[PDB]
């Protein structure tokens, strides 16, 4: 194989170190290779046993374990002597040797060795986050799980937290040095990290302490506003979306080609697509609520054709979100896309129920009676545009956390409710046969006694007692116990359970309010990413943008005349980012070393 | 003219709402009324985001209740009264379930039976959900908002009171 | 870009100057309350003929005005003569 033949002799020395590590008994390395089920070249195809510890198969079993779809750029052609007259190729080959010895020291979980190889290499934040996710995922692996593997997994998780702290401190020193150079650092896509930016590496690291740093939040807000400067508020961008032609020479951003490039820089922002998607969903909900409150005629109205083409455009948007998805399991795991599935499905049930017989009034009121369930569902999709607020977001995430404590509150009152309901339907009306009205006598009247309108005059009317004080001179002696079970059901419900929740909600708030802030900031990166991903046209026209995307895909696939240009980073600019990161890496290390000898105990 | 007199008293009602809101200012020299009044003006932002969280629950169950209570009817200002008036007072205690029995046109003994339509009965069920959410989730959440907002900025209310 | 660490250390120096005058007026309240009340109503001639409570208002520091000696000067100005 030409891939194993192209590796030089120091990669054979690292493979000899892997053979010496796998020559130890009860090794997790040989159990990790033995449960990898990959080929000797590195692909998962499910002689070769002798060279099974080569460094390319190690890089493939790291890149399968750390995330999905990584492939590092192992440029092994820089070790030739024909390219040895370059001024910076010795630092590049020291960087490749430090990266493979760093991955060897992460694989043997030797912390001081990996700290020294992380010191002498560059791109320390990205390598520390890949090592932190690699030691996060090595503890959850089945090959590294066993009887005697628990203390090594706990010390290796302590080493994962030790690598998690230091890159957050190095980016804190980068924010203390220069914020603009750190913002130029974090948008630089690494060539050895499969042409991805480091925020995407931080997302695949999935560490919430990295994304709650304010420098990464400033990089996310600068990517939110785009090429436009961030002096505008929400009402200024809303007035610019209301008046495009009267505000775009008046706005401060960045003869007619410069104004066309300023308008193309304005409409490529994700926050403009957020305002356009929120206005399109607000116009949907208002025009759909006006469709529900209007009386349906004998013929098909034009507003039903507008909502049919509108929701067919949302069905094409859901098919674009499913076809260009990042996995089909992640599409189901979004709550809002499942609400969009319930939205499109109940609109097809309501459209087929209205268009089965347009002259019948009974099919019209069955269609409006299911459209009532839809317009309950359509205002529950409007939570999603509350997530970019500073106040609505973590309280909405906290409410979706808080729903489990109401569900166990419902599971605790339910048996009180049905026990006093079967006692009240026994004592209110016995000597009667069993029907659906007996189920109405069990569940309807007790449920609304915990909310305030206990129906005690209605129990006086159903009790058949003709006294002045209302439970006297009754037809039966055994009916009077009604108020007494009420006196107990109401007491328990409005004193115990209702109050308990209050104490549940105080404790649940004071536990996970900061986890709601961190999951709100991770929702922040995801939204920015999703509304950077979404095209700029709103819903009514999104079918014309999907037709233009299908025409561009048909021109790229069949005619093959499509082309695109990408921005290439300069080598001196990336060398300035590398020397800025090396000056901060060293600075943070030294300060930590000054701060580590500044505590009491040492 | 008596009509100009009742228009003038009907705007003077808005004034005499405003004239007792100027009487907070002489509560600021008290040792007890002052920081709690400053804390109430701080606390108004958490009620405004509580109003911004219930509002879409309110208008969604209001457009569902005005759909199911009276369809086959034309659109008017009474349709807006059927969306916003009756749901808003169900979170305060007087749910109008006998009035929904009278507007539901059902002549049963137990009040939602023998109705003119099969599709009207879902009314109590959306209520069973709107009332649950409003008087269990949001109403309670605020309580936890007000405890956390008190325990954050009570000493900033003392310093801004001084 | 490079002014942030000097601005943070200079804000630390602003808090270091904010603590010491509150402690000096605490030592003035520990020495004599009547002489500190005669001190705080004295308008400085080099500070545009203004009293030091107005200088503290233009400083706008809430830790100075939450001291009880300044609150006693404010209550003595409330009751007047
Ligand atoms: C089932 C899942 C999708 C939940 C969605 C709720 C909607 C689509 C369903 C749930 C219960 C359904 C109702 C159940 C019973 C009846 C009575 C029948 O004579 C006419 C249809 C009608 C009035 C149904 C209309 C559609 C309905 C409201
Ligand atoms: C612990 C709590 C949440 C239990 C949940 C309440 C459920 C089980 C009860 C409470 C009130 C009930 C509704 C009250 C009245 C009617 C009208 C009639 O057509 C029978 C069904 C229907 C629509 C009931 C369905 C079931 C119902 C919604
Ligand atoms: C042990 C638990 C259940 C509490 C004990 C309470 C019992 C013993 C009491 C409380 C209130 C009482 C009722 C109050 C009044 C009347 C009306 C009378 O004409 C017949 C007995 C009857 C219906 C009583 C039966 C016993 C009763 C239910
Ligand atoms: C608008 C700002 C100053 C808020 C102050 C509220 C007062 C001044 C305003 C707000 C709404 C107004 C009312 C709106 C509508 C009508 C009906 C009209 O046939 C007579 C006047 C009357 C009854 C108005 C009287 C004045 C009024 C009550
Ligand atoms: C989330 C909450 C605070 C929403 C605010 C409630 C507003 C939108 C609703 C609630 C009750 C409503 C009022 C109820 C009844 C009437 C009488 C009639 O003349 C129509 C207008 C008027 C006066 C409504 C105006 C709008 C109103 C005040
Ligand atoms: C998935 C969510 C919506 C909860 C599911 C609840 C649905 C399936 C249930 C709960 C209560 C049910 C209603 C209770 C009673 C009746 C009266 C009957 O004559 C027609 C059906 C109808 C009107 C039911 C329709 C379906 C219904 C609304
Ligand atoms: Ca280095
Ligand atoms: Ca979607």
Residue numbers in the entry:
A (entry chain C): 487 to 532, 549 to 756, 787 to 1134
B (entry chain B): 892 to 1053
C (entry chain B): 649 to 729
From the paper:
The tetramerization of the NUDT9-H domain through the buckle helix remodels the interface between the enzymatic module and the channel module. This raises the question of whether the NUDT9-H enzyme module plays a direct role in channel gating of srTRPM2 on ADPR binding. To this end, we generated a truncated construct by removing NUDT9-H, srTRPM2–ΔNUDT9-H. Despite reduced protein expression level at the plasma membrane, the truncation construct still responded to ADPR and Ca2+, generating currents with similar characteristics to the WT. This is distinct to human TRPM2 (hsTRPM2), in which removal of NUDT9-H abolished ADPR-induced current. Single-channel analysis of srTRPM2–ΔNUDT9-H revealed channel gating kinetics similar to the WT, albeit with a reduced open rate. Notably, this construct exhibited long-lived closed states between bursts of channel opening, a pattern not observed in the WT protein. In agreement with the functional data, the overall structure of srTRPM2–ΔNUDT9-H closely resembles the channel module of srTRPM2, but with some minor conformational changes that may have contributed to the subtle differences in gating kinetics. Our result indicates that the NUDT9-H domain is dispensable for the channel activation of srTRPM2, which is consistent with the nvTRPM2 chanzyme, but plays a role in the regulation of the channel activity.
